[PDB]
Amino acid sequence: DMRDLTIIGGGPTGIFAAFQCGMNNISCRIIESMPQLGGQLAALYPEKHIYDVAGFPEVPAIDLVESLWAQAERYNPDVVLNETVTKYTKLDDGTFETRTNTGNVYRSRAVLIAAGLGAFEPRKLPQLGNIDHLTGSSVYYAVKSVEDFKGKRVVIVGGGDSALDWTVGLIKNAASVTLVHRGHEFQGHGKTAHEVERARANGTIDVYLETEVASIEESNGVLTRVHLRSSDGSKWTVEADRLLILIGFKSNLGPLARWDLELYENALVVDSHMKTSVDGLYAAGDIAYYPGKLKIIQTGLSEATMAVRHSLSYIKPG
Amino acid sequence: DMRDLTIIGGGPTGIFAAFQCGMNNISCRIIESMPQLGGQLAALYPEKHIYDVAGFPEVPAIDLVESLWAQAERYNPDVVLNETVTKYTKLDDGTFETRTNTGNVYRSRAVLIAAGLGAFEPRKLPQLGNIDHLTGSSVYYAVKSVEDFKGKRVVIVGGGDSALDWTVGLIKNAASVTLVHRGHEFQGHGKTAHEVERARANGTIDVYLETEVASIEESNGVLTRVHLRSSDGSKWTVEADRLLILIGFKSNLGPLARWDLELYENALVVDSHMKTSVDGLYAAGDIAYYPGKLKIIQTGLSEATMAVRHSLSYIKPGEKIRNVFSSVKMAKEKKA
Ligand SMILES: Cc1cc2nc3c(=O)[nH]c(=O)nc-3n(C[C@H](O)[C@H](O)[C@H](O)COP(=O)(O)OP(=O)(O)OC[C@H]3O[C@@H](n4cnc5c(N)ncnc54)[C@H](O)[C@@H]3O)c2cc1C
Numbered sequence: 001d002m003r004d005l006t007i008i009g010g011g012p013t014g015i016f017a018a019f020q021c022g023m024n025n026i027s028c029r030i031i032e033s034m035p036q037l038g039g040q041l042a043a044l045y046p047e048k049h050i051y052d053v054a055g056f057p058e059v060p061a062i063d064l065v066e067s068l069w070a071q072a073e074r075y076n077p078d079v080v081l082n083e084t085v086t087k088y089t090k091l092d093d094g095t096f097e098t099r100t101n102t103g104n105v106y107r108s109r110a111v112l113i114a115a116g117l118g119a120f121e122p123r124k125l126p127q128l129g130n131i132d133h134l135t136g137s138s139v140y141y142a143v144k145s146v147e148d149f150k151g152k153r154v155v156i157v158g159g160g161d162s163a164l165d166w167t168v169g170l171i172k173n174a175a176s177v178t179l180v181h182r183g184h185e186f187q188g189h190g191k192t193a194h195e196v197e198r199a200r201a202n203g204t205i206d207v208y209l210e211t212e213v214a215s216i217e218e219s220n221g222v223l224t225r226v227h228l229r230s231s232d233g234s235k236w237t238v239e240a241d242r243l244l245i246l247i248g249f250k251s252n253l254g255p256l257a258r259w260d261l262e263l264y265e266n267a268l269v270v271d272s273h274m275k276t277s278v279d280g281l282y283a284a285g286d287i288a289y290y291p292g293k294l295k296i297i298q299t300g301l302s303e304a305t306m307a308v309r310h311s312l313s314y315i316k317p318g
Numbered sequence: 319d320m321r322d323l324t325i326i327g328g329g330p331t332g333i334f335a336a337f338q339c340g341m342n343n344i345s346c347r348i349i350e351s352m353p354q355l356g357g358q359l360a361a362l363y364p365e366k367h368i369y370d371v372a373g374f375p376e377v378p379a380i381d382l383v384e385s386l387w388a389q390a391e392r393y394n395p396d397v398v399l400n401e402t403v404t405k406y407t408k409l410d411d412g413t414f415e416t417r418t419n420t421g422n423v424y425r426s427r428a429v430l431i432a433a434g435l436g437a438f439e440p441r442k443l444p445q446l447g448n449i450d451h452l453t454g455s456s457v458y459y460a461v462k463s464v465e466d467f468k469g470k471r472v473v474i475v476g477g478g479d480s481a482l483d484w485t486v487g488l489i490k491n492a493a494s495v496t497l498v499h500r501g502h503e504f505q506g507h508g509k510t511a512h513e514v515e516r517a518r519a520n521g522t523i524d525v526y527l528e529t530e531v532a533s534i535e536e537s538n539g540v541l542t543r544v545h546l547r548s549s550d551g552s553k554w555t556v557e558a559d560r561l562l563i564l565i566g567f568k569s570n571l572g573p574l575a576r577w578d579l580e581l582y583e584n585a586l587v588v589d590s591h592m593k594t595s596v597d598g599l600y601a602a603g604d605i606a607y608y609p610g611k612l613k614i615i616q617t618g619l620s621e622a623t624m625a626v627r628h629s630l631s632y633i634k635p636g637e638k639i640r641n642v643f644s645s646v647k648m649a650k651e652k653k654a
């Protein structure tokens with residue numbers, strides 16, 4: 001089933017781009033890697049208020065996503081969720097085939113890369129080496145079940161909302177809870193960050209800022225203890241059964257890095273029409289680069305309008 | 319006196335740029351030649367619905383202007399209305415002076431040109447010539463206030479919504495209302511045109527299609543009589559102490575076209591940072607040209623953001639810029 005434009009990524013840029021397709025009477029689909037649309041706004045800061053998007057005095061990120069989506073849904077674009085585009089091919093006839101990780105192939109007359117800053121892979125502690133054999137047993141990047149943390153000695157890495165929340169949530173579940181953050185202070189300093197220090201002074205938990213995991217110990221295929229290190233060179237070891245790492249998400253082009261396209265500082269280089277080196281292949285948003293590019297919402301919206309507009313000369317040359 | 323940025327023009331691009339100034343902790347002024355903000359939106363299509371602005375499914379143009387203003391008024395920026403910037407000078411210190419048509423001068427450390435397609439000015443009737451001594455007192459190009467027309471015998475010229483609106487508006491307020499328009503039909507339509515037509519029918523008002531104003535009479539420096547001529551050749555006179563001219567706004571790029579700055583088909587040529595050749599002098603919106611420029615609202619909005627962002631390097635030279643997002647930056651000042 002041929003569409004005019006395949007859009008890779010369902011952040012604010014891909015969404016507005018899908019609206020642009022409707023507005024301009026071309027069919028499209030959005031292929032999105034996450035289980036929901038909204039990109040960085042829905043994932044990293046859904047509840048935080050945005051101030052610098054035109055005509056929205058003060059708007060929670062996730063509401064803006066909803067405003068943008070409602071605007072585009074009128075035109076009923078195909079939305080593919082839970083699929084990551086890993087390859088494409090331009091065919092003899094100029095049309096496109098884009099492939100996702102589930103082996104699904106998608107046909108379009110042209111394509112728009114609106115993939116931002118990656119597909120939200122959890123960031124790790126690579127200083128610990130390849131510890132896949134511990135992963136999902138004693139080392140976690142998310143809490144898919146509290147069972148795993150129950151009556152266990154657990155250290156928690158991070159200083160955002162996820163690391164904070166779970167430090168208090170596991171006090172009652174776990175034998176011990178220890179928070180360790182690289183930063184000087186905690187990020188997202190609100191209601192939940194106003195009462196974090198309590199259990200620290202109380203002695204029910206341990207908190208360490210300015211410290212990082214230096215190494216770990218294991219016995220019979222399970223974590224035994226965690227070595228810590230502060231900025232001043234202070235080093236100590238702590239007994240730990242579980243490691244819970246919540247330090248955000250990685251930022252790179254993922255599979256799109258190995259598409260033979262001009263790059264400039266982890267972004268796709270783009271001309272005055274938002275076109276890559278390959279005709280009918282466009283980029284817009286955080287992922288696109290041109291002299292003067294700002295990586296903000298306002299600017300991604302403009303770029304989506306310009307990509308879609310020029311794409312009409314490729315899709316239907318009239 | 320001194321502001322960080324002088325913004326020439328208060329269309330959507332200028333209003334957003336003023337908001338951007340506030341976001342970036344710099345002061346500014348908007349200089350606008352119209353009696354209100356809004357540019358082509360307020361002037362040419364206020365009631366028309368806009369569909370292609372991000373996050374707005376449907377919005378009357380004038381409501382969009384209102385939303386953008388509501389956003390900008392957070393920082394209470396200076397607003398100079400009814401003045402047209404005619405020139406600028408870059409002084410020896412690198413700061414700027416802008417001069418308007420009323421002889422006022424404004425100082426700033428940098429300037430953004432967000433002048434669109436030109437200064438909007440009320441269209442005038444040449445057949446009357448220089449009547450500036452009557453303008454503001456017995457002759458008007460817009461209703462500055464309704465009290466100007468209370469108990470007056472008024473004539474209104476035009477066939478759009480504004481002419482139609484104030485015709486029915488001033489019926490109970492004024493003592494005599496005459497509407498003239500040089501077209502054979504009214505271009506404003508709907509609720510208003512029929513109210514006017516019903517008022518014509520029972521003779522509460524005079525209305526004359528295909529009629530243009532020929533001449534006026536005046537006594538004591540005030541309007542006294544208006545002379546009209548139809549399309550068939552008719553020619554008559556009304557007793558009128560008030561004349562309201564409402565035949566539209568005209569865009570006039572004139573003064574800025576005579577500046578020493580490169581143009582591409584009436585647009586000021588700009589670089590990757592929305593800067594013209596003169597450092598500290600920026601352009602954004604419909605007035606800005608760079609390869610691939612689309613003359614639309616969405617595009618002027620992000621251009622305003624890029625121009626204000628870079629202007630910081632000229633306004634505050636050498637100063638290290640801290641790349642915070644608005645969301646995080648407004649959270650830090652909510653804590654403090
Ligand atoms: C904490 C924080 C606060 C911010 N606050 C502001 C602010 O106040 N104002 C502002 O203007 N900007 C702000 N930003 C930046 C803003 O979020 C981004 O500029 C914006 O999200 C860019 O949208 P985008 O569509 O270009 O990219 P993204 O939001 O990154 O969306 C890209 C989408 O593509 C998907 N994807 C990636 N690869 C593939 C693949 N190969 N196949 C299928 N899908 C894929 C991803 O899952 C993602 O949904 C903030 C950023 C952060 C982190």
Ligand SMILES: Cc1cc2nc3c(=O)[nH]c(=O)nc-3n(C[C@H](O)[C@H](O)[C@H](O)COP(=O)(O)OP(=O)(O)OC[C@H]3O[C@@H](n4cnc5c(N)ncnc54)[C@H](O)[C@@H]3O)c2cc1C
Pocket residue numbers: 326327328329330331332349350351352355356357358359362363367368369370371401402403404432433434435436437438439573574602603604605613614615616618
């Ligand atoms: C009928 C019509 C419908 C349109 N519909 C849409 C639409 O649906 N969607 C869309 O995206 N775009 C639309 N547009 C285009 C859109 O209006 C413009 O892109 C937009 O107005 C540009 O904004 P701007 O602020 O940069 O310029 P402008 O809106 O033109 O504002 C410039 C302002 O500067 C003032 N000015 C100029 N020179 C001086 C000076 N020397 N001194 C003081 N003040 C000065 C002017 O009076 C004016 O108020 C439409 C245009 C028209 C004519």
